[PDB]
C-alpha cells in the first residue's frame, strides 16, 4: 500500500522550531484540506492535537501549529523542549471515502 | 438496496438483460434507478420484477 | 446541492450508441435538500402581506 511518505526521524535542539513533514498525492493531501496529526508516547494511545490542517482541540497548547503547501503538510512546532520526545503520525483524507496515514516520525531532541 | 450495506431509501439496484451491439451476445448489466422511475410490473406478489 | 457522491456508468445499447446510468455510490448516503435563510423569508412574506 502507499500509506503516504513520511520521514523516519527529525532532529533539533531546545528553543528551535521544527516541522514534521508528510507528502503524498494531490488527492490524498491536496484535494481536500482535511489533514490531522496524532502523537504517540511509547506504550500509550495516539493523542489528538491537530485537525483540519491548522486547528487545535480542547486544551492543546498553542505552540503547536499546522501548515500545508500543495501536496505536502507539516506539523510546525515552535520552541522545542525535551517533553516532545515521542513518535508522530499524520492522517488525511484517502482516495475514495477513506482515511490514509503515514509511516511515523520520531522526535529526537538532542 | 444494499449499496454499502444498509438500505438507500431512494435508489433501487436493478439488473437487466441488454441486447448488445452484436445482437446475438446479449449480456447481463446492472444499474441504480430512482423509485419515481420504477414501477412494479404486476399487482401479484412477484415484487422483485419491475419496469421503467 | 445533492450531497451524494454519485458515479456515472456507461452501457452500450445497440450498435454504436451508448446510454449513461447511475453506478455505485461512494461515501455515505445523505439527503438532497435546499436551504433558505429564515429571517429573510419571514421578512419577505411579511412584506408580501403588506402589499
Amino acid at each position, epitope marked *: 500500500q502507499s*500509506a503516504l511518505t513520511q520521514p523516519a526521524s527529525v532532529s533539533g535542539s531546545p528553543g528551535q522550531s521544527i516541522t514534521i513533514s508528510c507528502t503524498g498525492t494531490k488527492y490524498d493531501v491536496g484535494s481536500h484540506d*482535511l489533514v490531522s496529526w496524532y502523537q504517540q508516547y511509547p506504550g500509550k494511545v*495516539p493523542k489528538y492535537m491537530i485537525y483540519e490542517v491548522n486547528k487545535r482541540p480542547s486544551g492543546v497548547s498553542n505552540r503547536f501549529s499546522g501548515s500545508k503547501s500543495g501536496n505536502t503538510a507539516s506539523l510546525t512546532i515552535s520552541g522545542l523542549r525535551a517533553e516532545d520526545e515521542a513518535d508522530y503520525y499524520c492522517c488525511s*483524507f484517502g482516495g475514495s471515502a477513506t482515511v490514509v496515514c503515514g509511516g511515523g516520525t520520531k522526535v529526537t531532541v538532542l | 438496496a444494499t449499496v454499502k*450495506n444498509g438500505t438507500v431509501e431512494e435508489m433501487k439496484n436493478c439488473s437487466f438483460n441488454t441486447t448488445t451491439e452484436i445482437r446475438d451476445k446479449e449480456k447481463k448489466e446492472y444499474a441504480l434507478f430512482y423509485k419515481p422511475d420504477i414501477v412494479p410490473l404486476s399487482e401479484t406478489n412477484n415484487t422483485s420484477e419491475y419496469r421503467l | 446541492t445533492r450531497p451524494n457522491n454519485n458515479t456515472r456508468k456507461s452501457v452500450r445499447i445497440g450498435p454504436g450508441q451508448t446510454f449513461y446510468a447511475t453506478g455505485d455510490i461512494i461515501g455515505d448516503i445523505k*439527503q438532497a435538500h435546499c436551504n433558505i435563510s429564515e429571517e429573510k423569508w419571514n421578512d419577505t412574506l411579511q412584506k408580501v402581506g403588506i402589499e
Partner: nanobody
Amino acid sequence: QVQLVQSGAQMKNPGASVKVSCAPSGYTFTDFYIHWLRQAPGQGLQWMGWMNPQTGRTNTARNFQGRVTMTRDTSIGTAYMELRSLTSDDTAIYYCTTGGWISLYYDSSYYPNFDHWGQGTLLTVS
C-alpha cells in the same frame, strides 16, 4: 469528556477470526461515526475502516476488502469488529476511535478527527 473501552486481550492462531468490542461511556453511541485502525509493532499507523451506527453503512480500506467486517449494537450500544482470513502478520494493536459528527445534509465520514481513543487490544497470532 468521554471514554471508550475495548477487549482485554486476543491471543489466537491463524484461521480463527477475531472479535473486538468497543463500548462507549459518557455520550450517546448513535451520534458519531466510528473508525477502526490498526498499528503494527514498529510499523506506521494503518487505517482499517469506518462505520455509521445510525444507518449501519460501513466502508473499509481497499487492501482490507473481505478480511475486515464490522457491525453495531443498538440495545446497549457497542461496535463489533470481526477479522477474517487472518495470518501471523496481524499481530498488532487495534484501536476504536470516535470520528466526525453525523448530519443528514452533508458527508462527514472521511473526516480524520479521531477525537476520542479507546485503550485498544493486542492481537498475537503465531
